[PDB]
Amino acid sequence: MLKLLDNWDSVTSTFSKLREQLGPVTQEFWDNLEKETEGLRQEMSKDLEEVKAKVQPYLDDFQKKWQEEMELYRQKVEPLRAELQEGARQKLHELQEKLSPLGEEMRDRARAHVDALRTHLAPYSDELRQRLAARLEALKENGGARLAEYHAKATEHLSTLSEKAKPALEDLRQGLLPVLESFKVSFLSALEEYTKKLNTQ
Amino acid sequence: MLKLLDNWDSVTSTFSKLREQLGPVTQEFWDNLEKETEGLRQEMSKDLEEVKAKVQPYLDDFQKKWQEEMELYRQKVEPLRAELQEGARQKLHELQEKLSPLGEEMRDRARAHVDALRTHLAPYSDELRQRLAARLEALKENGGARLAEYHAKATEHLSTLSEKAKPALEDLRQGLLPVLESFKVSFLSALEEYTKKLNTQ
Amino acid sequence: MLKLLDNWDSVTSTFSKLREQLGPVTQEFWDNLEKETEGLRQEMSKDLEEVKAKVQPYLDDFQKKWQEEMELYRQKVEPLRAELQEGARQKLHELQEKLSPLGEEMRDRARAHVDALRTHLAPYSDELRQRLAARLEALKENGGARLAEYHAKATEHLSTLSEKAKPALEDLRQGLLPVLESFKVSFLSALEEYTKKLNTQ
Amino acid sequence: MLKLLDNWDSVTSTFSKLREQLGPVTQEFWDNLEKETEGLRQEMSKDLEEVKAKVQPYLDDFQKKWQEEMELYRQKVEPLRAELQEGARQKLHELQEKLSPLGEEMRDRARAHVDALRTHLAPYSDELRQRLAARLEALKENGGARLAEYHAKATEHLSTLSEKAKPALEDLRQGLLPVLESFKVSFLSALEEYTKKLNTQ
């Protein structure tokens, strides 16, 4: 029965080698690359430091320089602020006070229609209150049902043990009696299989 | 601030960057690698199935024959199955029945030792039996005790419900009730928000 | 052996066993717990959607109206949008154009400091520029070197293929070739295997 | 706009509490259980040890006792073995020698037909050999194509850097010049949004 089905043998030894064996690519390349790449990137980031270091304090100078111009402007402008600051507050202040007419207006006007619902509602509150509340009474009362149903079962369990522990306990106490075995002569067992085939074929 | 901060900008888009340009390593090389490799492999395997066809006829022509002859072999042998099978069954009882008696010899020869040790262990065998027995009763016994706890604690955690009920009801009432939505105007809201931002720094 | 080994048999089917009998804790209690709890919750929520219906009519009847009035509010206000919008645009240029000049004041007031520091950094700013420049050339330069390696190693790993070719071919020949399948019989095979087992211990 | 959608508030404060708050179950129960369960299971497994300890050597006695009976049987039976041992070898021995007729028979008979394929095959081996082999020549030759196509691209990459590094390098060197900003007066920006709404509504 020629096992030509080794078509794998044909492909594996041929194709697979070229691929798996061409793995030294990332080896010699990538690791050499990343080794020099980031490897010089580290020399540079550290080479740059000294630079940034030999300058920082100098540059620093400039920061205070910005701080200098800054305040001055923050100054000339400061006054214009109040002019607009309190300047606005006022017109807004007045407004709200000139907006209290809306009080007796809006309010006294709405008032009524608003209330409509107060009344169109009230019954429902009452309706639900009487409803949802009792719903929870069913919770406590029902909690007792399950608990009662539970405890009962818990108790029973502890009592079932008495009948269980007993039969199981005949196992070891007497197991030192029936350690009896099968003891197959051995060789004979060989004949057992032996003569069988004589007829199964 | 750190206008120099862009130093890392130049480190990254230079070193680690070219690396990504080499991803095509996996694009052109390994991709084209795998492409032809297994791709021709595909064109290869083809043959095995082809030839297979052109081969099968012969292989089969052959097959049908081999059997035709094998049968010659078989039939010219069977008689030995007898010459042998006979002698085999003979000794079978020589050992089934000459051995049978000794299989009892020990069958009982062991039994003694056992009945011996049986007695020999019984004390301990029982010291434990009755030991865990009463030790088991403790579990059941003290068990129910802590059981009562989970009942006693549940019965109380149950009654604590008629207490966390009432608040929600008020909350109920509340959520139902009207909403006299106060009214400003984006314009007003605008001023508020506005002047709010005019007194910052 | 260890006929007493069954001691652990009794420890396990007793202690850790009853525990599993209490899994129903999660079956009867928490299951029935969650069952009604969220189950009635389900019957509860129902109302909110119901009432909602009976409530919507009113809420809407109301809604349509509130607007009818709000509009009163709005329209009686708009004129202020003018009294205010006017005064607003006024000061707008007071600051757009009175401020505009100072925005340049610094616009250039800063520029100096800059042009200053510009010169102040240039040296370093360039010490680095030309530094990594030539330092970059090294990468390119020495890079191609190790590149040559992966080529040189590939060109050789390529020629090593015309070598692992020939064996498979012989293997080819082989796998093709006939099979003079030697013939025994299960019967014979039986004897072999048989007697094999007769000289063990 | 009455947010009655707090239907969660209604359910959460009610239903959720009873469940999450009934978690003390596994707390007081389970941990008390497993604490006593395995807690006494440990006292027992250790209580049992001493037992097994005060007996082992005793029991041990018995093991040698089995060892005693064992050998004796292993003895009486031992002889019957050879009778069957060499007793079988023989009939099997003869057989194979009386089975050599099958040699000149089976073989010289098959021989021919077998060969048929030797010849019905041979060409195909030759056919495939000439085929599959050249297939691999296409591998080496094609490996060179990709490699050549690759190296080329690798090289180009290292050369592209020269044109890239350059423009990017104007960034930091001069970035110490255009650190120019937006500088929004701030408060004015408030008017920017301010007067906008005046018309968007």
Residue at token pair 């050999």: D129
Test A187 with D81 for CB contact under 8 angstroms.
yes
Neighbours of C138 (CB within 10 A): 12
Q: What distance in Å separates residue D32's CA from the closest CA in chain B?
A: 8
Test D139 with A84 for CB contact under 8 angstroms.
no
Test D2 with B150 for CB contact under 8 angstroms.
no
SS3 C179: coil
Cα–Cα distance, B162 to D18 (Å, whole number): 11
Test C183 with B70 for CB contact under 8 angstroms.
yes
Query: What amino acid is encoded at C115 in this protein?
Result: D
Instruction: Please list, residue by residue across B56-86, b when 16 or more beta carbons sit within 10 angstroms of its beta carbon and e when fewer do.
Output: eeeeeeeeeeeeeeeeebeeeeeebeeebee
Q: Are C48 and D7 in contact (CB under 8 A)?
A: yes
Q: Are D109 and B116 in contact (CB under 8 A)?
A: no
Cα–Cα distance, B12 to B6 (Å, whole number): 10
Using an 8 Å CB-CB cutoff, list chain D residues near B3. 175-176, 179
Token readout for C27 is 């079956």
Token readout for C100 is 């505009």
Q: Are A177 and B120 in contact (CB under 8 A)?
A: no
Token readout for D182 is 């937006």
Chain Cα centroid distance, residue A192 = 63
Cα–Cα distance, B72 to B66 (Å, whole number): 10
Token readout for A198 is 């004589």
Nearest CB partner across the interface for D2, out of B113, B175, B190: B175
Test A143 with D18 for CB contact under 8 angstroms.
yes
Q: What distance in Å separates residue D51's CA from the closest CA in chain B?
A: 7
Cα–Cα distance, B58 to A128 (Å, whole number): 92
Using an 8 Å CB-CB cutoff, list chain D residues near B36. 139, 142
CB pairs under 8 A between A and D: 17
Cα–Cα distance, B22 to D157 (Å, whole number): 8
Token readout for C200 is 């063990």
Sorted by where each begins, the domain ranges of chain B are: 1-201
Question: Rg of chain D over CA atoms, in angstroms?
Answer: 48
Using an 8 Å CB-CB cutoff, list chain B residues near D47. 131
Q: What distance in Å separates residue B48's CA from the closest CA in chain C?
A: 11
Token readout for A48 is 């740059």
Test D169 with B10 for CB contact under 8 angstroms.
yes
Neighbours of A48 (CB within 10 A): 19
Test C70 with B183 for CB contact under 8 angstroms.
yes
Cα–Cα distance, C99 to A97 (Å, whole number): 33
Q: What is the DSSP letter of A142?
A: H
Name the residue in chain A with its Cα closest to that of B174.
Answer: A125
Test D140 with C154 for CB contact under 8 angstroms.
no
H helix or E strand, kind and range, residue B117: helix B102-159
Helix axes B166-176, A108-168, angle to 10 degrees: 150
Token readout for B199 is 């007194």
Q: How many CA atoms lie within 13 A of C174 on its CB side?
A: 10
Q: Are D125 and C172 in contact (CB under 8 A)?
A: yes
Using an 8 Å CB-CB cutoff, list chain B residues near A177. 114-115, 118
Which of A72, D188, B73, B129 has the alpha carbon at shortest distance from C88?
D188
Name the residue in chain D with its Cα closest to that of C81.
Answer: D198
Neighbours of chain C (3+ CB pairs under 8 A): A, B, D
Helix axes D187-200, B186-197, angle to 10 degrees: 180
Token readout for B53 is 């066809």
CB pairs under 8 A between A and B: 160
Using an 8 Å CB-CB cutoff, list chain C residues near A36. 139, 142-143
Instruction: Please list, residue by residue across B135-173, b when 16 or more beta carbons sit within 10 angstroms of its beta carbon and e when fewer do.
Output: ebeebbeebeeebeebeeebeebbeebeeebeebbeebe
Neighbours of B36 (CB within 10 A): 19
The torsion of the CA quartet C74, C79, C83, C89, rounded to 10 degrees, works out to: 80
Helix axes A78-98, A30-76, angle to 10 degrees: 80
Using an 8 Å CB-CB cutoff, list chain B residues near C62. none
Question: Rg of chain A over CA atoms, in angstroms?
Answer: 48
Query: What amino acid is encoded at C91 in this protein?
Result: K
Three-class SS of chain D: CCCCCCHHHHHHHHHHHHHHCCCHHHHHCHHHHHHHHHHHHHHHHHHHHHHHHHHHHHHHHHHHHHHHHHHHHHHHCHHHHHHHHHHHHHHHHHHHHHCCHHHHHHHHHHHHHHHHHHHHHHHHHHHHHHHHHHHHHHHHHHHHHHHHHHHHHHHHHHHHHHHHHHHHCCHHHHHCCCCCCCCCCCHHHHHHHHHHHHHHC
Cα–Cα distance, A61 to D49 (Å, whole number): 83
H helix or E strand, kind and range, residue C30: helix C30-75
Q: Are D169 and C56 in contact (CB under 8 A)?
A: no
Neighbours of A150 (CB within 10 A): 21
Query: What amino acid is encoded at D43 in this protein?
Result: E
Q: Are C11 and D41 in contact (CB under 8 A)?
A: yes
Which of C140, D156, A46, C125 has the alpha carbon at shortest distance from B14?
C140
Test A132 with D187 for CB contact under 8 angstroms.
no
Neighbours of C44 (CB within 10 A): 20
Phi, psi (rounded to 5 degrees) for A29: -85, -80
Cα–Cα separations (whole angstroms), residue C153 to A22, A28, C61: 10, 10, 88
Cα–Cα distance, B43 to B40 (Å, whole number): 5
CB pairs under 8 A between A and C: 177
SS3 B118: helix
Q: Are A116 and C58 in contact (CB under 8 A)?
A: yes
Q: Yes or no: is domain A1-201 CATH 1.20.5.1230? A: yes
Residues listed for chain D? 201
Helix axes D78-98, C186-197, angle to 10 degrees: 150
Q: What distance in Å separates residue B73's CA from the closest CA in chain C?
A: 9
**Cβ neighbours of residue D25 closer than 8 Å, sequence gap 6 or more:** B150, C25, C29, C30
Nearest CB partner across the interface for B176, out of A125, A172, A173: A125
Which of A157, C39, A149 has the alpha carbon at shortest distance from B154?
A149
Test C158 with D143 for CB contact under 8 angstroms.
yes
Cα–Cα distance, B65 to D110 (Å, whole number): 9
Residue at token pair 């502890």: A158
Neighbours of D84 (CB within 10 A): 20
> What approach was used to elucidate this structure?
X-ray
Q: Are D148 and B30 in contact (CB under 8 A)?
A: no
Test C77 with B14 for CB contact under 8 angstroms.
no
Cα–Cα distance, C140 to D159 (Å, whole number): 8
Q: What is the DSSP letter of B27?
A: I
Test A197 with C179 for CB contact under 8 angstroms.
no
Cα–Cα distance, B172 to B63 (Å, whole number): 91
Cα–Cα distance, A52 to A60 (Å, whole number): 11
C185–chain B Cβ distance below 8 A for any pair: yes
Instruction: Please list, residue by residue across D189-200, b when 16 or more beta carbons sit within 10 angstroms of its beta carbon and e when fewer do.
Output: ebbeebbeebee
Test B183 with A102 for CB contact under 8 angstroms.
yes
Chain A stretch 26-65, residues whose beta carbon is closer than 8 A to a beta carbon of chain C:
28-29, 32-33, 36-37, 40, 44, 47-48, 51, 54-55, 58-59, 62, 65
**Cβ neighbours of residue A11 closer than 8 Å, sequence gap 6 or more:** B41, B44, B45
Cα–Cα separations (whole angstroms), residue D199 to B186, C96, D189, D193, D194: 11, 20, 17, 11, 10
Query: What amino acid is encoded at A65 in this protein?
Result: K
Name the residue in chain C with its Cα closest to that of D86.
Answer: C195
Cα–Cα distance, C57 to B65 (Å, whole number): 96
Cα–Cα distance, C59 to D4 (Å, whole number): 12
Cα–Cα distance, A106 to A114 (Å, whole number): 11
Cα–Cα distance, A26 to C150 (Å, whole number): 10
Token readout for D149 is 């196509």
Using an 8 Å CB-CB cutoff, list chain A residues near C152. none
Test C73 with B183 for CB contact under 8 angstroms.
yes
Which of A194, C194, C185 has the alpha carbon at shortest distance from D102?
C185
Resolution in A: 4.0
- First and final CA of chain D: distance in angstroms? 22
Q: Following DSSP, what letter does each residue of B154-189 receive, concatenated?
A: HHHHHHTTTTSSHHHHHHHHHHHS--------HHHH
Using an 8 Å CB-CB cutoff, list chain B residues near D53. none
**Cβ neighbours of residue B163 closer than 8 Å, sequence gap 6 or more:** none
Q: Are A92 and B195 in contact (CB under 8 A)?
A: yes
Name the residue in chain D with its Cα closest to that of B167.
Answer: D13
Q: Are B111 and A178 in contact (CB under 8 A)?
A: no
Q: What is the DSSP letter of B6?
A: G
Using an 8 Å CB-CB cutoff, list chain C residues near B77. 185, 187
Helix axes B102-159, A108-168, angle to 10 degrees: 160
Handedness of CA D151, D156, D162, D168 (dihedral sign): negative
Token readout for D181 is 């900003």
**Cβ neighbours of residue C137 closer than 8 Å, sequence gap 6 or more:** none
Q: Are B128 and D51 in contact (CB under 8 A)?
A: yes
The torsion of the CA quartet D27, D33, D36, D41, rounded to 10 degrees, works out to: -130
Chain A stretch 91-150, residues whose beta carbon is closer than 8 A to a beta carbon of chain C:
91, 95, 102, 105-106, 109-110, 113, 116-117, 120-121, 124, 128, 131-132, 135, 138-139, 142, 146-147, 149-150
Q: Following DSSP, what letter does each residue of C91-115 receive, concatenated?
A: HHHHHHHHHTTHHHHHHHHHHHHHH
Name the H helices within A77-186: 78-98, 101-102, 108-168, 171-175
